[PDB]
Design a protein around this ligand. Structure first.
Ligand code: 1YN
Ligand code: HEM
Length: 527
């Protein structure tokens, strides 16, 4: 033994004096071997869900998960069942598939999991400090209440003509259309829909001043701010690169613009009930009496606009793309437009939108097939026992829930990969509570989150934008349908989703050909 302890020390010294051909070599093989040995040992544990095997330490299953998450989930599900873990760029993600996974993650106790700890590192640099995920959950809850206060039926009634005006202006003025000059053309929907989305959301939520800014070089700041909203920021949120500083600059410049308007509205006592800015100026005091600062108000405006931007733009792109190979659905939607709007003699209102079930069912079905967020995350803050299992998810893990995956399962939606708006006949609401409700601070929502359809998530982190999204999408698609027919270039069809971007937008270029339904129809107004 004595001799052995000596030769241990000796072996150590001979180890340190290896040629750096082998030292560099051992710098690679040692962690590689430890990783594989650690996994085999991990597999022996019965209080842990199975862990997907991976070859490269730290990286884990990043590539296959990033490129095709639903295919990844399906294969893991076949081998391991509904609960399994995988390593992702240094983190361990525990996936719980299906309605029980929805319950496990969306209805997890506040003490058990943290959304802000999963999300803040990306969003905070983009939006700014003090809001959304850069604050305690209790603060988020009331910010959602504040924002929801501008998103009432009365507001939607006033937004609908504004959104309509923006859509028509876009048809009139955008080079992508120019309907007074051209009767047919080709567009990339991932060019048109982001523009139509920011134009309509700006006009209605932010108001005319902020909409007008988008016709200036100021619009480039939004483009710059947009480039900070990228999944890689979950890993590298701050690097001394240029686009990171353009991001920081844009946030300052845009929030500064919002603050300028806010302070100006207050100076002139010009605070009314037009938009989300008026609403937050009038209603942004927390229940402990602390008021949101003008900066936090501006930051919250940025987050709300950015949130609504990507989910909605991707969704209307998908709607156009699915309908492009379905002239039968376009035809059916057009008949409904003619029926509800008296052949076009009626002006579209929010109330008439609610009487367009097939149009709303079209949005609903598109959100089924294209959940914009394929994976929602929480960081596990306290050890969690998985009910009816021996599994414990330890603090420091992340949990991953994927309702968009269940959207595409035949067991819950027959012929799930078929686009069929009629699967929602007599069920055209954006969603609803099938039972008991609870209020986390921003209104009563469904207590259960077991619905296999969950485009807007559930529990305390549930979306509050769904009715604004349907309003915006509804107005936009109503006008599209009444104005245009469209189809694919020969041999083109619905593109696959890009699962590596922030939302599951279509892989580009995603082009459709439009044609005026009334070649001679003119859009009035000056330009
Ligand atoms: C590196 C190699 C490469 C192959 N790779 N390897 C892995 N990946 C990858 C993995 C995962 C993902 N992502 C996609 C994005 N995703 C995600 C994005 C946003 C998100 O948002 C949830 C929260 C925060 O943002 C919002 C989004 N939102 C909700 N409604 C509207 N937007 C949010 C909520 C509230 C407010 Cl005010 C703003 C915002 Cl933005 O909710 C959650 C997940 C995580 C997985 C992407 C790429 C790769 O690309
Ligand atoms: C089709 C459109 C949209 C879809 C499918 C969608 C989806 C979602 C989902 C799944 C969540 C929960 C995320 C999680 O649990 O981690 C969420 C949260 C949220 N979304 Fe949306 N969203 C949409 C549009 C919007 C719009 C238009 C707005 C604002 C007007 C908005 C603002 C918010 C807010 C404030 C939250 C709460 C975040 C939290 O509490 O952590 N969303 N959304």
């Amino acid at each position: 033994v004595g001799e052995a302890l000596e030769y241990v020390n000796i072996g150590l010294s001979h180890f340190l004096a290896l040629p750096l051909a082998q030292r560099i070599s051992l710098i690679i093989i040692i962690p590689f071997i430890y990783n594989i040995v650690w996994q085999l040992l991990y597999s022996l544990r019965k209080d842990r869900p199975p862990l997907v095997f991976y070859w490269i330490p730290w990286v884990g299953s990043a590539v296959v998960y990033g490129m095709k998450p639903y295919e990844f989930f399906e294969e893991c599900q076949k081998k391991y069942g509904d609960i399994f873990s995988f390593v992702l760029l240094g983190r361990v993600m525990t996936v719980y598939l299906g309605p029980k996974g929805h319950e496990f993650v969306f209805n997890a106790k506040l003490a058990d999991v943290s959304a802000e700890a999963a999300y803040a590192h990306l969003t905070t640099p983009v939006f700014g400090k003090g809001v959304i995920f850069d604050c305690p959950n209790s603060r988020l809850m009331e910010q959602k209440k504040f924002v929801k206060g501008a998103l009432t039926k009365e507001a939607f009634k006033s937004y609908v003509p504004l959104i309509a005006e923006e859509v028509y202006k876009y048809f009139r003025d955008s080079k992508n259309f120019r309907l007074n000059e051209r009767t047919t053309g080709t567009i990339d929907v991932m060019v048109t829909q982001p523009e139509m989305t920011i134009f309509t959301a700006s006009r209605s939520l932010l108001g005319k001043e902020m909409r007008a800014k988008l016709d200036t070089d100021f619009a480039y700041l939004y483009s710059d701010l947009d480039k900070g909203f990228t999944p890689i920021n979950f890993v590298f949120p701050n690097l001394p690169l240029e686009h990171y500083r353009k991001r920081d600059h844009a946030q300052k410049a845009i929030s500064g613009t919002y603050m300028s308007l806010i302070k100006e509205r207050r100076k002139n006592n010009d605070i009314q009930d037009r938009d989300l800015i008026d609403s937050l100026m009038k209603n942004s005091t927390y229940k402990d009496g602390v008021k949101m600062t003008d900066q936090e108000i501006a930051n919250l405006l940025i987050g709300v606009l950015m949130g609504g931007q990507h989910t909605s733009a991707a969704t209307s792109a998908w709607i156009l793309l699915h309908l492009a190979e379905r002239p039968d659905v376009q035809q059916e939607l057009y008949e409904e437009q003619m029926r509800v709007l008296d052949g076009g003699k009626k002006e579209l209102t929010y109330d008439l939108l609610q009487e367009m079930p097939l149009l709303n069912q079209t949005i609903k079905e598109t959100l089924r097939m294209h959940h914009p967020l394929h994976s929602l995350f929480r960081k596990v803050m306290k050890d969690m026992h998985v009910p009816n299992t021996s599994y414990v998810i330890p603090a420091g893990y992340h949990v991953l829930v994927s309702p968009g995956y269940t959207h595409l399962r035949d067991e819950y939606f027959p012929n799930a990969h078929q686009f069929n708006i009629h699967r929602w006949n007599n069920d055209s609401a954006s969603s609803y509570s099938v039972g008991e409700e609870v209020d986390y601070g921003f209104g009563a929502i469904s207590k259960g989150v077991s619905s296999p359809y969950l485009p807007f998530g559930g529990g305390r982190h549930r979306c509050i934008g769904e009715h604004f999204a349907y309003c915006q999408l509804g107005v936009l698609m109503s006008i599209f349908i009444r104005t245009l027919k469209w189809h694919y270039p020969e041999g083109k069809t619905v593109p696959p989703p890009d699962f590596t971007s922030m939302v599951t937008l279509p892989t580009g270029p995603a082009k459709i050909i439009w044609e005026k339904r009334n070649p001679e129809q003119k859009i009035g107004g000056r330009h």
